[PDB]
Amino acid sequence: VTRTAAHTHIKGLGLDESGVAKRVEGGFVGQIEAREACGVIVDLIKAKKMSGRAILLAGGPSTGKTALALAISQELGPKVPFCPLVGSELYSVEVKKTETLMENFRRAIGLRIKETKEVYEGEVTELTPEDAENPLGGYGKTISHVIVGLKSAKGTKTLRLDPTIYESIQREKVSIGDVIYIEANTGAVKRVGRSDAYATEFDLETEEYVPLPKGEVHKKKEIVQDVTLHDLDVANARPQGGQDVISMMGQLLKPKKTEITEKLRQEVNKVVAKYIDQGVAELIPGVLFIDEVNMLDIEIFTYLNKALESNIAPVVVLASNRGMTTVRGTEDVISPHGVPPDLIDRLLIVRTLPYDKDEIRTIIERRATVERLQVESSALDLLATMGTETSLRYALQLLAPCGILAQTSNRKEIVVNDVNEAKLLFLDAKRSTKILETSANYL
Amino acid sequence: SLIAAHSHITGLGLDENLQPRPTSEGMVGQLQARRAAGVILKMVQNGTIAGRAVLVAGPPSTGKTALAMGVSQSLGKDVPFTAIAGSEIFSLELSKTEALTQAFRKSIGIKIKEETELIEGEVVEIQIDRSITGGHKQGKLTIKTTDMETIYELGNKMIDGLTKEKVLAGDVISIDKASGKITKLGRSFARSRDYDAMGADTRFVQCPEGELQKRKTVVHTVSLHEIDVINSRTQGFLALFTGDTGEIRSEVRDQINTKVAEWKEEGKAEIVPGVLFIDEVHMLDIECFSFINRALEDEFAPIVMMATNRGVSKTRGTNYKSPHGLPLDLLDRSIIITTKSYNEQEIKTILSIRAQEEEVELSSDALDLLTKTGVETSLRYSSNLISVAQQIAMKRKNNTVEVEDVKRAYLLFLDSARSVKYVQENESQYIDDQGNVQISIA
Amino acid sequence: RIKETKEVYEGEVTELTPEDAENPLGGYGKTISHVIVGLKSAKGTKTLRLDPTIYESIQREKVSIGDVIYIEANTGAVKRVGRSDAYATEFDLETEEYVPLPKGEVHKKKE
């Protein structure tokens, strides 16, 4: 019924109250010290006082760094932002790599705002323009005022708008007899639909029909919102939302990512600090996950060691799969985990350890229960032996085809014959490499 | 339309117990690979497991693309099947991760259920009122049938759909409310007014009976990438066709993911997972393989079908050399279907099926000669020689292609090995790798 | 390659009339029942009784008496080629080029 995405078995770090790790909780098997360190990091996030703290989840494949990052995200909650990333994301053909890095940095930092908006809404009973005096002159608009009659329950008001408001009014094609919604903060207006006081069974435009809006007109409504700092930056750089010709023309163009200047970021920070001190804003710093950090070259790391030392930069977590390898972008620096020694002093290494046979067997059992296929004990032991012998991942991916073969065999039980048929149909990396070695057709 | 290299494969040739038949659905051979491909097909048809990488391995001229295209044929309509190649990723407007993400979003489909309304009747009277500049329009349309008559209001789109493909009083039209389509079925009243401009009068139809408004529910399929680009900009519907969409932000991605899950839980949308097929996946780069190994771990990721014809070869962008050109971390994620070379009976069945699909009456001895040629040189050469031999037989005015046509075609056109020997025999005539040549006979 | 047929009326307009109507609605400047146009070509002359909707296309495209035009049957959209060759009356100064009077009949069904 529900699709499994190789991580649905993970619900949290599974720690106890004192920071110790239960052996089985949240779909985690083993990795006790890694889980405790990640829980300490989660507590450090919920402290919400630090800036530019970084950790590296060192370890081999099939070990659980990515699992630990999503476990951190599950434990932290969807209110605090989490920005997953891959190292190949940072290379863009439209803007510099470093600006993509800082854009992800300010995607990570969140904000909690509560704003009051002046709102005009009601049914349009009257809509009469006023003509201008000199229409063909063209240095003024063709109208001067528009009188609008708005009616709702308990209140009724007449509205003498500026022509610039009537621009948006005509752009939403407002007719007489529909319920509209003027937002006085930006001048935007939304046409809800035709009012249901009249007949609603004779239109041809599949319009939605709405009752009269409750409450008076000039409703002042307070709403709560969650936005990121990057979204403020991209709204102020590409100013869509006003009712001036710059904003109306900026809606129509195809947006390109531009190098957002630092001055915009200081102005946004000053405005946000005023919102903090005024009392409607509360900062929510977040967590940014750069997976496959070996793929980043020397320029990103060189900029990263300066970008982490700012007052606002979030906590970034890093994953590496390689050991003692050369850094990309250079040809002489040989460094652990593909990470230069300049960055590694800022970095707090969290090691992860490989698995035993029993841990692999329990992981296969929980992954089979999450994928809603029940297994036999000898077949589970066989899959555990293959997981020790080939890899954990190959034993994980083979679970669904033997289930398919089981439904083919008109039974719900997985037997060892299904496992042997999964061995015979599909191959791991090692047998494929040996088959490449014996053949001369460059198979 | 036209006959291509893969015209003959109609299905995977597979029985209901997931066992391949020897020769069915336009396929032969590769019994274990056919069984594994059917298992992957049943996995897709279940549609509850996401991001299972499947790799196909084998020598060239073995049937890898034939296997994948048979999977696409037996996969059924209205379920997405992208067939990208490895070289198409490297663009000047997208990033490679962005191009992979767009292929991923193209591969996954949404079956939107929509409620519509059909009206069909005899048109009574049109009352289109327009402004002086013609920009703003409002009208009243009046339509009847044998039973009852209704007066409807008009909007901008319906009036402009009445203007183009112009409708007069006396016509029978059908309007769909959800799509806004206008289908003039014909002229029924046959009115006495005949303007000299109208020369195209539609055919007479009986005016319809029964109620005008008939309830109807229809389903239409739209992929995730199309919804993504539609919500991306103001004019997004053009960017499907011009392809000027690019570097789309992650915000619209996550918001559309939430909205898609919303439409799923209220019953509007039924997600069907698809298949992304990347032919010649050894052509890709190491950054692309990094994004691929980190991109299958989402719920909105399809079954990825990969193909290679390389041995232990160099992984691109990197100094080292890896099995199939694919790195070890990606190779561990994938599960490998293997393919093995053919023999004389399977090759004979291949050319017989091809010549049946190539409408060529081939004689039996010429078929034996073509099989010996195919085993001797390659399957593709003996596949290609059939149409040429047919043309040569057409030039000699005999329908049946005989042995002398095959020998003349073999003499006229060269295969790989004979061309290699002919180059090696007199290499001074051709331009050398060092750019040296002799263009004079003396 | 695509084959089709083109049913067109071509010629030189000698007279176009926005003909009025009985019962002319109310508060309206005109009430056009139909438009009669008189076309002239080489060895051909026709009077065409058109729908009223061609009138605003005629009035937009500056179609007056003494011009060569070229219309389509099913679309009913006028395309003004120019003025006729003989009616170069303003012999001192002119801008619009004078197309020759078109050959063939007034009604052509070409493929």
């Binding site: 009249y198 007949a199 | 009277e125 049109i126 009352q127 209001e153 009083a169 | 056009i32 009223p52």
Partner: peptide, 28 residues
Amino acid sequence: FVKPRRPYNSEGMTRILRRYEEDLFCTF
């Protein structure tokens, strides 16, 4: 009781009228 039809403000407009016998056009 059945709700009234929506008001039809068409003042300030030309009029295309096509009927069974003949087609009109009211302009300004």
